[PDB]
Scaffold this active site. Structure first.
Site, short mmCIF file in Angstrom:
data_model
loop_
_atom_site.label_atom_id
_atom_site.label_comp_id
_atom_site.label_asym_id
_atom_site.label_seq_id
_atom_site.Cartn_x
_atom_site.Cartn_y
_atom_site.Cartn_z
N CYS A 123 24.03 -25.96 -14.93
CA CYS A 123 24.08 -24.79 -15.70
C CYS A 123 25.70 -24.37 -14.83
O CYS A 123 26.33 -25.36 -15.56
CB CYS A 123 22.70 -24.20 -14.60
N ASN A 164 13.47 -14.30 -13.18
CA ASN A 164 12.55 -15.12 -14.06
C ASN A 164 12.84 -15.73 -14.88
O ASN A 164 14.84 -16.09 -15.29
CB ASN A 164 11.87 -13.85 -14.59
N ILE A 165 13.14 -16.88 -15.23
CA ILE A 165 12.92 -17.94 -16.41
C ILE A 165 11.73 -18.06 -17.24
O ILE A 165 10.74 -18.00 -17.04
CB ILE A 165 13.16 -18.91 -15.46
N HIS A 198 9.52 -18.92 -23.03
CA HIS A 198 9.93 -19.32 -23.94
C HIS A 198 11.05 -19.86 -24.30
O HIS A 198 11.77 -20.91 -24.81
CB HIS A 198 9.76 -17.76 -25.17
#
Length: 165
Positions: free
Chosen positions: A98, A73-74, A77
């Site tokens: 990344c 999950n990303i 926020h």
């Protein structure tokens, strides 16, 4: 001669925002002498390698870090925090990366394109071109679901929009 070597999967995004895989030493001269970076935003939570830190010490390039899980999950926020960093003209030219510049980088940039009001068709198509062969439905799902009301409210107040080519 081929002495200039950008990092694998490097590309301009918009204005003075860039994307790439994790830079290596042979990429340093391109990032510094040609792109003339002011900042780097790394999207992995791990410790920045010492050799890259030394490159930052030598050049004065500032490091920002928003550690997204590398699982998955990303959360919204973390995307908003990253957007506030890269959209600030006071942080540019800035390189987003990344590990390979495919997933976490691709998810964030897709949200930038959403602020540019690109069609989802072209956002996902750009994401998949950079992510091939590992395009993830989840990264595109995060882009589709990201509520950008807040960052747009933050952005308009500062007058960062529209993004300039």
């Amino acid at each position: 001669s081929g002495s200039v070597i950008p990092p694998e999967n490097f590309s301009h995004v918009v204005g003075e925002i860039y994307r790439s895989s994790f830079p290596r030493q042979e990429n340093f001269s391109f990032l510094h002498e040609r792109l003339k970076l002011k900042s780097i935003l790394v999207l992995i939570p791990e410790e920045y390698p010492q050799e890259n830190l030394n490159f930052l010490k030598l050049t004065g390039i500032k490091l920002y870090q928003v550690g997204m899980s590398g699982n998955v999950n990303i959360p919204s926020h973390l995307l908003t925090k990253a957007l506030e960093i890269v959209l600030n003209p006071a942080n540019q030219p800035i390189l987003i990366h990344c590990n390979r510049g495919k997933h976490r980088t691709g998810c964030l940039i897709g949200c930038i394109r959403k602020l540019q009001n690109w069609s989802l068709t072209m956002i996902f198509d750009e994401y998949r071109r950079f992510a091939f062969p590992k395009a993830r439905a989840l990264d595109q799902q995060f882009i589709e679901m990201y509520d950008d009301d807040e960052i747009k409210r933050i952005a308009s107040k500062n007058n960062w929009l529209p993004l300039q080519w």
